[PDB]
């Protein structure tokens, strides 16, 4: 599963935009789009928000968790517990990248947000590497990977699983 497909699953979260045009309700297959009134918030899927921002027709409102204090608290919590910790969103990295790259004049203090998300990502990736090493060293058959997002799995997947398959084949041969 390539990273583009993982982004494709992260382009369906809900974000708030403040449009400038006016449009009535739109009946999409996945839901009902709220009435589009200028200078009035209307929640839309992330792909629509990105398209509107690229076409100069909206103004993205930052999500709640995108604050310096909250991100610092999350980073400090992550660097404290041995196992993984819950994240403010299951697609925090993709959301951060897309929002900070496509709409940075609306989001304030983007640089510190990008610096803290990166630290949390680095710590979680190091924990995942330790988990993989311990799994292979101990010749285990099960592992509990809680609170782990999809992109972090995609980083090491298709390498961990194949190594485990070969190890299992070499582990039960006389039987």
């Amino acid at each position: 599963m390539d990273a583009s497909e993982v982004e494709f699953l992260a382009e369906k979260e809900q974000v708030t935009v403040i449009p400038n045009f006016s449009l009535d309700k739109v009946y999409l297959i996945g839901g009902d789009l709220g009435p589009f009134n200028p200078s009035l918030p209307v929640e839309v899927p992330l792909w629509l928000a990105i398209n509107l921002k690229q076409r100069q027709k909206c103004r993205i409102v930052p999500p709640e968790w995108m604050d310096v204090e909250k991100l610092e608290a999350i980073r400090d919590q992550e660097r404290r517990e041995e196992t993984f910790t819950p994240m403010p969103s299951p697609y925090y990295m993709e959301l951060t990248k897309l929002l900070l790259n496509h709409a940075a004049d609306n989001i304030p203090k983007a640089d510190e947000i990008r610096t803290l998300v990166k630290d949390t990502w680095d710590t979680r990736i190091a924990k995942l590497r330790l988990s993989a090493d311990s799994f292979v060293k101990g010749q285990e058959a099960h592992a509990k990977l809680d609170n782990l997002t999809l992109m972090e799995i995609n980083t090491i997947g298709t390498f961990f699983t194949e190594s485990l398959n070969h190890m299992y084949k070499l582990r039960t041969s006389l039987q």
């Binding site: 739109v26 999409l28 297959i29 058959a141 099960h142 990977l145 699983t161």
Partner: protein
């Protein structure tokens, strides 16, 4: 069933099909419903006056759903092409009351593919072979799915007393109590029925 739930079922089927080593159960009803909705929405979009932004919204949504449907069908086709003999043999001995694994079109496609392969191999090589050695059993040559591959999963319905490595006592802990919403790394053979019954999602 709202259309949103139909789309969610399509997404779940797509993800489950991508990570499974074997060919999972067919879901032709969802495919037909999604296809019908797309077909209706095409004309619904065509009627609308040009220059409307709703045209862009609906067209983007249609392009966003068609890709998922095509990817799911492509994965099924590739799995059928890689393991046609075993799949056909399992279909021949299918028992009533067990859900089918192949839609009729896929069954016809598999038959045609097997016929093409057998005819080509026979005509090209087997005719000029020694008379004693001219029969090749495709059930013992084409590879088989590796049901022991490790997969990632997320649990939806709680399961208790799950046996890890049932055939060996070497493992220190052999019992796992799966909770709701947790994720585990485990072999596919152990949790195949859970995926089949919808209690576990492969992500």
């Amino acid at each position: 069933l709202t259309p949103a739930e139909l789309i969610n079922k399509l997404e779940e089927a797509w993800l489950n099909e991508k990570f499974a080593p074997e060919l999972l159960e067919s879901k032709s009803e969802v495919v037909e419903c999604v296809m019908e909705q797309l077909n209706h929405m095409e004309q619904n979009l065509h009627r609308a006056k040009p220059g409307d932004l709703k045209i862009s919204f609906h067209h983007m949504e249609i392009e966003r759903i068609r890709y998922m449907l095509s990817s799911y069908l492509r994965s099924r086709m590739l799995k059928i092409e890689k393991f046609f003999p075993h799949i056909l043999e399992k279909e021949k001995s299918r028992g009533e009351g067990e859900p089918p694994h192949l839609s009729p079109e896929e069954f016809a496609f598999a038959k045609e593919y097997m016929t093409n392969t057998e005819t080509l191999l026979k005509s090209v090589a087997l005719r000029h072979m020694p008379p004693n050695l001219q029969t090749v059993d495709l059930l013992k040559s084409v590879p088989k799915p590796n049901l022991d591959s490790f997969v990632f999963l997320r649990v939806k319905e709680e399961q208790n007393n799950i046996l890890v490595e049932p055939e060996t006592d070497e493992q220190s802990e052999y019992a796992i109590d799966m909770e709701v919403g947790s994720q585990h790394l485990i072999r596919y053979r152990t949790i195949a029925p859970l995926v089949a019954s919808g209690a576990v999602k492969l992500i």
